[PDB]
Amino acid sequence: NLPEHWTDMNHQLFCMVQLEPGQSEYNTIKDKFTRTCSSYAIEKIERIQNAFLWQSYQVKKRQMDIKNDHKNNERLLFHGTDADSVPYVNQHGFNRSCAGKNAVSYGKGTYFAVDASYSAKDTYSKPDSNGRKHMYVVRVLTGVFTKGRAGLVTPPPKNPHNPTDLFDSVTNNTRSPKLFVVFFDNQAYPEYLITFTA
Amino acid sequence: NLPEHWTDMNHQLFCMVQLEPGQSEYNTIKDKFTRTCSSYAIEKIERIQNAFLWQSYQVKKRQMDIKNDHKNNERLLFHGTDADSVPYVNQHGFNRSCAVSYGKGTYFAVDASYSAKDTYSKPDSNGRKHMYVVRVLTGVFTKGRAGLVTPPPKNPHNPTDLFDSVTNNTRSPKLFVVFFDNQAYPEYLITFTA
Ligand SMILES: CC(C)c1ccc2c(c1)sc1nncn12
Structure with missing residues (x-):
């Protein structure tokens, strides 16, 4: 089910494709990036x-589209990271067990930002040498979501009397969400890598 | 593509089906159980x-069959747990985030005797x-160690081409650890007593 606008990879499982401005x-x-980081300049996208990441992600999406019925389960969000993590994320995606403690923590998971400006902080997108x-x-399966809490290792139940029927993600604020946290593998697909500078 | 031996689910996506004794x-x-646990009494299987757990596991199985270029990636292992964790596992499978001497993943035993210790399969009231x-995608494995968050690389030259699992002992393993969701499918639950 590999999408048809992708370049032919020739029985290869992985490729980075340089986009052309225009x-x-x-x-x-x-x-989408410059809307909140117009002071930075993009080297490349x-x-x-x-x-493999695409297939596993698309299965989880089909499962969430079935389970939630007529929701928009998928959001396009930003993740800033260090140079040393880029090869791992390119091949293996987002790993909660590697994730940094966020400065405002809404759970122990992988964080994604609504605004490029949040991801552009040196604490997340650490400038390399x-x-x-x-x-x-990142295409992120945010699904049905609630306000998180620092102690969460999984999203919380929708209903305390049904502890295994869970929210899909958590956020900082349900009315104006600026970040999302996800607690499961293959819930996020890294679609594009932006390299940028001051 | 839900397996032959499964019984009809009336268009449901989850159920627990008690097996007919004999x-x-x-x-x-x-x-498989009595091979090492014949002193225990089976109440049900x-x-x-x-x-959904089955689809996600099968996808990862096909990926590892392609990656490793052979089809011997799967082992049937045991996992013992407390009664309060059973409903989560039935619905969501194994979650590394819930001792961890060979790394921070989920532990599976070759023998039911290991999993039958009260420290894992904790007796309820x-x-x-x-x-x-459990069906586990052990694939190509190496010896683990404390504080692993994923398995090590096969070649430190290529740090993202990893082992599929770690073990206590490569020559004669008695346990495996997996660090990713959907590398294990919980296939049967055994209710038993000492
Ligand atoms: C001693 C340690 C490595 C260990 C930890 C957990 C565990 C086992 C062994 S065997 C088993 N079956 N379910 C859980 N576990």
Whole structure:
């Protein structure tokens, strides 16, 4: 079920594809980024073609579309990280067991930002030895969500008398969400890597 | 593509099906257990029919069959747990975030005797103990150590091409640890007593 606009990979399981400015695909990501980080400049945007991460993510999405019936389960969010993590995330995606304690913690999980400006902080997108900062644009299965709490290792139950029927994610604020936390593998697909500088 | 031996679910996605004592599937699973736990009394064996856990596991199985270029990635192991964790496992499988001497993942035993210790299959009020029979994608494995968050790389030259699991002993393993969701399918739950 590999998407048809992807480059042919030739029995290869993984590829980074450099986007060209002037293409809609580049321009949409640049605009989404510059909306809140117009003081930074983009070096490049690579499309992540990871067949295994894509398949496992698309199965979880189909399962959430079935379970939630007629919700928008998928959001496009940002994740800033250090240069040393980029190879791991490219191949293996987002791993809660590697995740940093956020400065405002709404659970022990992987954090995603609504605004590029949050991910562009040096604490998340740590500038490398050449001043390159790195930020992923991520399809994230936010599903049905609630306000989190620092102690969560999984999302909380919707109903305390049914402890195993869970929210899909948590947020900082249900009325104006600016971040989301997810507690399961293959709930996030890293779609694009933005490399940028001051 | 839900397996032959599963029974009809009336368009449901989860159910626990109690096995008929003395029939083939029950005898197969009983024998695996009694090989090392013949002093314990089996009260029941339930088949876990979780369509979503099964789909996610099968996808990861096919990926590891392609990755490793052979089809010997799967082992049938035991997991003992407390009664308060059984409903989560039936619905969501194994979660590393819930000793951890060989790394921070989920532990599976080769022998039911290991999982039958009270420290894993904790007796509830009436002395009932709980053990899963689990399909585990052990794949290519290496010796683990404390504080692993994923398995090590096969070559430190290529740090993202990892082992699939770790063990206590590569030559004669008695336990495996997996660090990813959907590398284990809980296939049968054994309710038993000392
Ligand atoms: C001593 C330690 C490595 C260990 C920890 C947990 C565990 C086992 C062994 S065997 C088993 N079956 N279910 C759980 N566990």
